[PDB]
Amino acid sequence: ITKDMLPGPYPKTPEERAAAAKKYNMRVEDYEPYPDDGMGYGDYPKLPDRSQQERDPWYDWDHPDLRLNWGEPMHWDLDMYIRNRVDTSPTPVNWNLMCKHLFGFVAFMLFMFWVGETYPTYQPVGPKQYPYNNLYLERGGDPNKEPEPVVHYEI
């Protein structure tokens, strides 16, 4: 490996852009760098942010698990777009509609659990009745004190 095959500064002349595209092994009309706002990308290509899951799986890849070739310019976030991580693959339902359905379902369920908590069900009975002054010694009451007389009657 040598110096002019390593990434360099941001290309500003079109011949430096062509040398950059020749360096990253891709077409000059396909080569697009990151916008020069000073984030440290330099001349590195802005690939269109596709996950490696979206690649053709039946192709005889050089790296089949990564779905990536030798000499192919990797994405800046190639560690992020592996098939073990963030997938950008197309979904049969729209993303905004998925967010609407999920947020509406979760919010409706939370609201209806709050409605059921505000208006709870019960059985048409009285309280459960316990002897010995509502079980004063069993619940941990001290025997030197004396509770108020809880007396239940027959019915």
Ligand X SMILES: CCCCCCCCCCCCCCCCCC(=O)OC[C@H](COP(=O)(O)OCCN)OC(=O)CCCCCCCCCCCCCCCCC
Identify residues 47-106 at the interface with other proteins (CB under 8 A): 49-50, 54-60, 62-66, 69-74, 76-80, 83-99, 101-102, 105
Residue type, 154: E
Please choose which of other proteins, ligand X, none residue 136 contacts, taking the beta carbon within 5 to 8 angstroms, the exact cut-off set by kind. none
**Beta-bridge partners for 68:** 63
Cα torsion angle, 113, 118, 119, 123, sign? positive
- The tokens describing 56, both together, are 């053709």
When the beta carbons of 62 and 87 are compared against ligand X, the nearer one is 87
Shortest Cβ 15–other proteins spacing (Å):
19
Give, as ranges, the residues between 115 and 144 that touch other proteins (CB under 8 A).
115-117, 119-123, 140
> Which residue among 16, 19, 42, 141 contacts other proteins (CB under 8 A)?
42
Tally of CB atoms within 10 A around 31: 20
The residue among 114, 152, 116 whose CA lies nearest residue 132 is 152
Shortest Cβ 129–other proteins spacing (Å):
12
Instruction: Quote the DSSP letter at residue 73.
Output: P
- The tokens describing 97, both together, are 């509609």
Please choose which of ligand X, other proteins, none residue 107 contacts, taking the beta carbon within 5 to 8 angstroms, the exact cut-off set by kind. none
When the beta carbons of 78 and 137 are compared against other proteins, the nearer one is 78
d(CA 9, CA 36): 10
When the beta carbons of 87 and 138 are compared against ligand X, the nearer one is 87
When the beta carbons of 20 and 52 are compared against ligand X, the nearer one is 52
Q: Which residues of this chain interact with ligand X, rule CB under 6 A? A: 85-87
Instruction: Quote the DSSP letter at residue 70.
Output: S
Cα radius of gyration (the chain) = 35
Shortest Cβ 154–other proteins spacing (Å):
18
